[PDB]
């Protein structure tokens, strides 16, 4: 159900004689038998777990924390990464750019794995097959197949019913709409094909 | 005792920015440009309007209390025309007539080493 490989990596317990085994999101280039270095003093190498205050601008990070200690939230999907936009030491914070293109200021103590995540290019290949889609969602969850609401009865959906399959009312739904109404394009600022780019 | 700022003249086309800053550049004094002196839009780069803006700047910076100014004059530059506007000739004369002492005049127009791409198209501006 995950596009990216995971990395079984073992550290030593600093306080007791015992090995501690961790679950990492494998960055592209990590291999078995590779030493990785987690800490604020580590080098800027792929797989290391520097804080953002320790990495410089332009750094590719992944598995970045939102707050220091939540053990990774940002840029965890296959092939995704976070860009270190900039720093400010006073009121220690770091501006970063997220995979969606959004900028976020988060504390400089939050950690991340240097590099990009393995499994990149996954959505490049067309499934070609409802069977491939079936096996893809069989491990994820029960979200497939998707019946169109226009193809159902008015009891079952806002879009259902009619002598022709059509929505009837505008398919853009307001944010303040209630459950049972939020079917279609929720809070759509605009619709239709964009003759444009992301424009981050 | 001579305390000096830096002139920072921008003699673009259709505009003449004149504003004196400190020797560091981080603190600015008297940011006046041709528009604030001339009403008609076609004369924001007129020599008269640039002279007026420059003398206004000179009065403000002398009443702030600096005696000398090192001149740094600049055209639009980069990709653009690189030929300074009438303000370049008008403003320095305006400061000299005001009587603010002048030193170390230098052209600081930003030239590119292999500029990105000119504007106007391959056939250019077919006016």
């Amino acid at each position: 159900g995950r596009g990216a490989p995971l990395a079984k990596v073992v550290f030593r317990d600093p306080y007791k004689y015992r090995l501690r085994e961790e679950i990492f999101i494998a960055n592209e280039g990590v291999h078995t038998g590779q030493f990785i270095y987690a800490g604020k003093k580590a080098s800027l190498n792929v797989g290391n777990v520097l804080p953002l205050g320790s990495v410089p601008e332009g750094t590719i990070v992944s598995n970045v924390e939102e707050k220091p200690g939540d053990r990774g939230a940002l840029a965890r999907a296959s092939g995704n990464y976070v860009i270190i936009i900039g720093h400010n030491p006073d009121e220690n914070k770091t501006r970063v750019r997220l995979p969606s293109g959004a900028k976020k200021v988060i504390s400089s103590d939050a950690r991340g794995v240097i590099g990009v995540i393995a499994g990149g290019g996954r959505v490049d290949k067309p499934l070609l097959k409802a069977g491939r889609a079936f096996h893809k969602y069989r491990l994820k969850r029960n979200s497939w197949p998707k019946t169109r609401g226009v193809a159902m009865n008015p009891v079952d959906h806002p879009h259902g019913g009619g002598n022709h399959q059509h929505i009837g009312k505008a398919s853009t739904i307001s944010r303040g709409a209630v459950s049972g109404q939020k079917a279609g394009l929720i809070a759509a600022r605009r619709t239709g094909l964009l003759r444009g780019s992301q424009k981050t | 005792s001579q305390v000096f700022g830096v002139a920072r003249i921008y003699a673009s086309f259709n505009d003449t920015f004149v504003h004196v800053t400190d020797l560091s550049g981080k603190e600015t004094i008297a940011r006046v440009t041709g528009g604030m002196k001339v009403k008609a839009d076609r004369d924001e780069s007129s020599p008269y309007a640039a002279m007026l803006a420059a003398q206004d700047v000179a009065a403000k910076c002398k009443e702030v209390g600096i005696t000398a100014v090192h001149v740094k004059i600049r055209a639009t530059g980069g990709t653009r025309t690189k030929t300074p506007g009438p303000g370049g000739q008008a403003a320095l004369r305006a400061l000299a007539r005001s009587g603010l002492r002048i030193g170390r005049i230098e052209d600081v127009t930003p030239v590119p080493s292999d500029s990105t791409r000119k504007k106007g198209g391959r056939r250019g501006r077919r006016l």
């Binding site: - | 400190d22 020797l23 560091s24 600081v108």
Partner: protein, 226 residues
């Protein structure tokens, strides 16, 4: 556009100088002139402590002003304020530069222009990118019109310039670099190293850029013991 702006404010003065005050800026001990000028700052309110806003200012200053000599007029030096102590903030070397007029005057056609650049780290952990320019000259008694270089002279010249610069920086800290840059010992040294390859006049060193700042300067040398 005095009467063109339909709205000056979409949402709907106190003179800055009154809250502002002057500060005095000094150079390091490698230049014959110490004072370089004055600078406005906001008043050091306890919430803000404008000393921090001072600690990050850079001033471009003419080497002619820093040396009282007209022959240094075409060079300029960036001085970065790094230490503030009581209205006599003193800077440090940040980078040297030329004047665009001097560069464009020294650049002429019917001759070859050679450029070299190095990224060498000094012995006091400073990392300097140095650029050195050089031009070809027609010899006396020459009748040829242009006096270009055969692109192997250019390569050997660039190699020798790079190694002279690297050897000079590797062995001297920043202060020695400034104190040997201002008499331009490099120019005659490199002409001596090159003259058996191609005449090559106008071998000035162009701009130089820094990357570092000093530490907290507590015990022996130049900043507090008095």
């Amino acid at each position: 556009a005095v009467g063109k702006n339909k709205r000056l404010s979409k949402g709907k003065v106190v003179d800055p100088f009154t809250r502002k005050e002057w500060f005095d800026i000094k150079a390091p001990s490698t230049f014959e002139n110490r004072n370089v000028g004055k600078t406005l700052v906001n008043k050091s309110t306890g919430l803000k402590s404008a000393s921090d806003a001072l600690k990050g200012r850079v001033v471009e200053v003419c080497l002619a002003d820093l040396q009282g000599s007209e022959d240094h007029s075409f060079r300029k030096i960036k001085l970065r304020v790094d230490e503030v102590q009581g209205k006599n903030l003193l800077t440090n070397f940040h980078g040297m530069d030329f004047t665009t007029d001097k560069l464009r005057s020294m650049v002429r056609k019917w001759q070859t222009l050679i450029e070299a650049n190095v990224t060498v780290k000094t012995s006091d952990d400073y990392v300097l990118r140095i650029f050195a320019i050089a031009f070809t000259r027609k010899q006396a008694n020459q009748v040829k019109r242009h006096s270009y270089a055969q692109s192997s002279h250019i390569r050997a010249i660039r190699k020798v310039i790079s190694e002279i610069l690297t050897k000079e920086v590797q062995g001297s800290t920043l202060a020695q670099l400034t104190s040997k840059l201002i008499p331009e010992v490099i120019n005659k040294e490199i002409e001596n190293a090159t003259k058996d390859i191609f005449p090559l006049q106008n071998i000035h060193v162009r701009k130089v850029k820094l990357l570092k700042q000093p530490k907290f300067d507590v015990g022996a040398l130049m900043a507090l013991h008095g």
